[PDB]
């Protein structure tokens, strides 16, 4: 199929790109290079195996993506392309909604406006908000997610429903992500991101690889087994897989499919750290730290839906994904080249 | 005060014009004519006793809004602009998220950009969602509206909410109409629906100038007094007052301030019915007719808080609502001209 990925050039986006390409795809990328590099181009290529054609823009440019989208004939479109710091969107909320509210609502007018009727939207488990229900299924009603971040992807949801209810020949699928990690086994691909990052893998990868002292473990006192936050970790490359069977699965099958896409299964703060010195062959220095603004305990995601339904589940472990990580961070230090 | 007010030319804008004039204000109109006409300025003008500037244009043009602030230096600003028919906006959805959504997010940007910080927001009771407790009183949480519209509405509320949280010097408005209603008391002014009206009262009064037929009274099996839906009308010339009351007394007070602007009181579709009948010297057709999809039974407003915290409260009855919408639809049978 011919496929327009919008932040093909992020961490998730590389990575479906290449699974894309492997399956034959014929991919256009679409981003604007605001939180990745060019670099990774000729990798996703390379990995991919075929040439992803690669346009620099922004979503918000609604009569470019109009003509994208008509001068590549294109027949579906996975949404990537956004902001995604949760503390800098409680900051900066204006530009959280404008990348990513009326960054999406530009995307989908040019696709009315060239007659592309298939999307993937990349959502989060945050839409369910403070559910004490857990895990969290597809059948739930959602919530409302505690900042700027949260609340645009809800937001989308709601548009896009309205959408297909209103032109009902749109196929729209809300894959609601859990906790990514990891990278490509070749560890030449992976999580880049610039200045500190705000998730916890990437954090104890940099305290790991000597760039960081320790790692802030954010609350010690929650109700869990170990009493640190407890999540559901999932491998980017499962992730990725997992994008590419809903688009060829959904693609022109009617209706607004939504499914959550983690491991089903939790981890806590503690997991994850002794996974990693495991990994890196070091013990990942850490200490307590003070519960972090709006962090829920714990949380899951109730995949069934997605097994059932489109014969996906994720095969990568917690040991792969911090093995994974540790690979690429230990390989490219830099990360992508200026 | 120096005042932009966006939608100023549609019904309740106009309206709001006149009050603001009348309170000695420098008023600029900002609007698209896409519901109202050119002939309505000169009616403000008259009747607010003062000229009010006028500025074609597009809230969703955030570069025009900025120059516009700047360039009148603009103090506050009243946004009455947007799309409000809830049934085309569920076959358009669209079109209300890009026009009230973005269109709101531009203007705000705009006004950051030119230094700008006092805003009124014109919200509704829609807000609430399906709330059993009625009347609605601001300390309620928010719903989930059933329309495109509504939920552009509440999108909106907390949009603003998360900017003044980032930007704690603004002082933001969030005001809550129940259902406008009536006009100035001149006759010279008023709502002017273009094609079939969408709410009770200029259909009412369509049907009593002989234009249509019979109202439809959509739904009689309500559990309601009379069995037809209850709500809360307000004249918009108290709306239009507590719109300038809200923005001379909020005008550079750090927060959200949100308030219910409606009568406290409900009124059954028969009650209004029969208060047209007595207004325009003859019974008004009508007929039963099955419920409208959406509809809620009953609410009205718990308006005392702004009694309260601006001594505002309504003075006009719902025998004035009619006689002021009768006066205005039979002087001018044709609206304002082309
Ligand atoms: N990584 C996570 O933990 C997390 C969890 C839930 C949801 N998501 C969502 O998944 C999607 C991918 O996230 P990611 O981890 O790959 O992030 P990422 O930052 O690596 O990828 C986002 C990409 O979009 C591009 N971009 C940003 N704004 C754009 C715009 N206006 N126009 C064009 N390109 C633009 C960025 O430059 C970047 O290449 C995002 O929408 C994110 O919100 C990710
Ligand atoms: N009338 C009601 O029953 C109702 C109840 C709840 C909320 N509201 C809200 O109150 C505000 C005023 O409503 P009204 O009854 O006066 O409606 P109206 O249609 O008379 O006024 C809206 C005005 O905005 C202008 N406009 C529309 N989109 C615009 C855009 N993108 N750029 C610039 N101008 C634009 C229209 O041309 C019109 O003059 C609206 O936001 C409406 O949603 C009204
Ligand atoms: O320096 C750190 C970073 C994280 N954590 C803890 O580790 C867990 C995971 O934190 P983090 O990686 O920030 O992930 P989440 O807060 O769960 O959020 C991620 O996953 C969500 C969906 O579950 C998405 O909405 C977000 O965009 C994405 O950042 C939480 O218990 C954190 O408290 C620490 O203790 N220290
Ligand atoms: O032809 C008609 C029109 C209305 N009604 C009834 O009269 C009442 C008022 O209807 P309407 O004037 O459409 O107002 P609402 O549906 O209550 O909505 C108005 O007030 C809301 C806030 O209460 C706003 O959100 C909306 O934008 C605005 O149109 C309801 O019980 C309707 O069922 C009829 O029976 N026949
Ligand atoms: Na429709
Ligand atoms: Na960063
Ligand atoms: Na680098
Ligand atoms: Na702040
Ligand atoms: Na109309
Ligand atoms: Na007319």
């Given at each position: 199929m011919r496929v327009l990925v919008t932040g093909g050039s992020g961490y998730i986006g590389s990575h479906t790109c290449v699974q894309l390409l492997q399956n034959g795809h014929d991919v256009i990328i679409l981003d604007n290079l605001c939180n990745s590099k060019r670099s990774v181009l000729p990798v996703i290529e390379r990995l991919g195996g075929k040439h992803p054609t690669f346009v620099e823009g922004d979503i918000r440019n609604e009569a470019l993506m109009t003509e994208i989208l008509h001068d590549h004939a294109i027949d579906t479109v996975i949404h990537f392309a956004g902001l995604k710091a949760v503390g800098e969107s409680v900051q900066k909320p204006l530009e959280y909604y404008d990348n990513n509210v009326n960054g999406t609502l530009r995307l989908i007018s040019a696709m009315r406006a060239a007659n592309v009727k298939n999307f993937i939207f990349s959502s989060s488990?945050?839409?369910?908000?403070?559910?004490?229900?857990?895990?969290?299924?597809?059948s739930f009603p959602t919530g409302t997610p505690q900042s700027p971040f949260g609340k645009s992807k809800l937001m989308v949801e709601q548009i896009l429903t309205d959408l297909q209810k209103a032109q009902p020949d749109w196929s729209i699928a809300l894959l609601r992500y859990f906790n990514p990690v990891g990278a490509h086994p070749s560890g030449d691909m992976g999580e880049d991101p610039q200045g500190?990052?705000?998730?916890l893998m990437p954090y104890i990868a940099q305290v790991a690889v000597g760039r960081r002292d320790s790692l802030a473990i954010?609350?010690?006192?929650?109700?869990?087994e170990d009493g640190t936050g407890v999540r559901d970790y999932i491998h980017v490359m499962d992730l990725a897989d997992g994008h590419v069977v809903a688009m060829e699965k959904l693609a022109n099958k009617p209706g607004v499919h939504i499914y959550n896409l983690g491991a089903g299964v939790g981890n806590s703060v503690l997991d994850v750290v002794n996974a990693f010195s495991k990994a890196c062959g070091k013990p990942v220095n850490y200490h307590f730290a003070p519960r972090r603004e709006g962090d829920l305990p714990a949380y899951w995601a109730d995949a069934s839906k997605a097994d059932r339904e489109l014969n996906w589940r994720v095969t990568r472990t917690l040991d792969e994904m911090a093995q994974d990580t540790w690979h690429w961070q230990s390989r490219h230090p830099q990360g992508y080249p200026d």
């Open positions: 488990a945050t839409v369910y908000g403070d559910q004490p229900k857990i895990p969290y299924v597809e500190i990052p705000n998730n954010f609350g010690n006192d929650y109700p869990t």
